[PDB]
Nucleic acid binder design. Sequence first.
RNA 1: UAAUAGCGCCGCAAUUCAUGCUGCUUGCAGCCUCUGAAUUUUGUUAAAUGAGGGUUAGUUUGACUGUAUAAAUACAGUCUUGCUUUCUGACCCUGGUAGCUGCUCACCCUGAUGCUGCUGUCAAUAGACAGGAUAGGUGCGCUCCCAGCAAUAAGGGCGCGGACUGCUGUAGUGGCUACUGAAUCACCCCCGAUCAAGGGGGAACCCUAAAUGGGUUGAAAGGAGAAGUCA
DNA 2: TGACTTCTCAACCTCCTA
DNA 3: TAGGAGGTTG
Length: 437
Amino acid sequence: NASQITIQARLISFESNRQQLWKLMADLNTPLINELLCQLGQHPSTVVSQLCQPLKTDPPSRLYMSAIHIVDYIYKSWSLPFPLVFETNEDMVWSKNQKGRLCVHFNGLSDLIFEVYCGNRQLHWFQRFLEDQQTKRKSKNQHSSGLFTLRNGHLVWLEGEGKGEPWNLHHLTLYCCVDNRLWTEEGTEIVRQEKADEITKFITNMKKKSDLSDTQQALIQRKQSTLTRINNSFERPSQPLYQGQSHILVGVSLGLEKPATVAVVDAIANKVLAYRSIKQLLGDNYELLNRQRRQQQYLSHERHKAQKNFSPNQFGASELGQHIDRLLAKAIVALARTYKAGSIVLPKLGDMREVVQSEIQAIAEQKFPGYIEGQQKYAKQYRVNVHRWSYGRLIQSIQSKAAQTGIVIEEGKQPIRGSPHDKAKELALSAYNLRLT
RNA sequence: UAAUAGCGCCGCAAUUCAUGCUGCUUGCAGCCUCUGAAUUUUGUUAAAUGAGGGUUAGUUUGACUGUAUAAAUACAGUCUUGCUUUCUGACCCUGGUAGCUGCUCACCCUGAUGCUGCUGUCAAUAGACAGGAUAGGUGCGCUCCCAGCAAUAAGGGCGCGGACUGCUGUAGUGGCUACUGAAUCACCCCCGAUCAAGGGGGAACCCUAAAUGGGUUGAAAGGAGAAGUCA
DNA sequence: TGACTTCTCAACCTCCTA
DNA sequence: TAGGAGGTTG
């Protein structure tokens, strides 16, 4: 599921409860994590479950295999304490305060009730979590947990500048992973269909093998309960999802001179429904691209000044690049949705170092026809000024936005030369031709 | 006095187009009013970017429902919370105190993606005082260029000693800590809190005759963690 | 440090209390 | 009976 997103909030409590949480994780959770890593490093992740069992009594029950899960995710990769992750929809118990605010109660923490402070841009997610747990309570465990919209959540701490307290300096922050497709009723229908298919495949797969008489039967009972309870749905909002036209394709061409141009084109016919350039996608936020290019130049020069020896280079850095890469993705997906586009086509990232080099060569030859010295000089100056875009965050951001809205994404091969609009159109047509296979 | 020239950007123009408008013949014809695209040609008495370091639980971008709704949107109602970000404003500063620490210099030459560059007064010393972000140059910036430095790029020349070193003063230039000075804001003012909490008062614009009558008094985007690799 | 890459995204079934 | 906390497992 690439549609899942992450919401965040800040948790608030008395100094006493905050002290208990700080002590509990900093003195127990992160030492246990460090110990378990030190153990796995010298080991000659299933065995980790019984590896941690002896460590249980050495120094909060759910937090012990929370640390196991953290360790497993660390291993599979190949004064703030580490984040405490609850990888369960039901680890958190939501409630409404007497003053109306939401509160979280964690399973391992009986008396630790934290009031939730969030932004109105994402309060509806917390209200949805509350309504979901209330619906399960009303149905008396008659709804499958795969549709409570709260996949998992980890609690972290954050740093301050008061410099005068053990924990009052650090702010709590809850990060809940929420499945965006799980909001609307029809998206939940699709999620239920996929999860039922996965359950069928997994039950068929393990039935071909033999397991313990009690644990395997417990798993089977759990899966049958899930399949039974998954058909009973929730009273969620209804949205018609998205239709999508197969023959309409929105191709996006990435380059150096123009970071992103877009062509909405028919495939059954050959007419381009509409082009849009970078200035037309950013709109009123176009000065952001130019000031970001200037900032990128400044930062690159500063890094090359201090590659020998200086302090960290984050001086003057920001997330303007991410903001632009999100504005661009929003605009592109909106443009696709306007024309009922059925798919957004993007260049393969690997063929991105080649494309920018070819574009620089093309620009140099366009400026200086055959003067090789001038072409090299202009290429150097252009690389100095028009720095390489961050074509990785853009592709990922477009993927996230398209998956959220429902527009499928295909990958094509960007043509080497031609005008950016022509490159975009031919990219889209090439993608459609490959899809014909 | 100097910034010639070059590159990127920003607009102003012209031509050509359509991703534009018209017209139905719905893919054609014309046109450039809008919206843009592509060049080249310019930087005004004009336009748009761009403007050193900081300051808000800042405002807006929100959810559901019912519609008119294909949908946009708009309306109505209810609810709304304060997270992480990017702009635009407005405001404050151009720091002090102590310490601790890194770098670089016998002296010359060439001169780096090297450093410095605001105004005014006092001096015309090298520094204070007052202001202050319009801050060396071009409309704006740049590794470009200009003036000075340049030991703190690189390379070369090159004296006295010890056997790679010294010719070195806080001298220049950086970093770290602790305390500390101002703004602690989003129409303005006052009080009040910061693991919470808002309240009061005032001004102006539209509706409204007028009414504590209502509003308005800038907007945007979010998928987060962890690990590894490359540069 | 930037850039890239990988991965992460339960859940009903038990027992226990108030 | 309805929460609160533990279990397990490919």
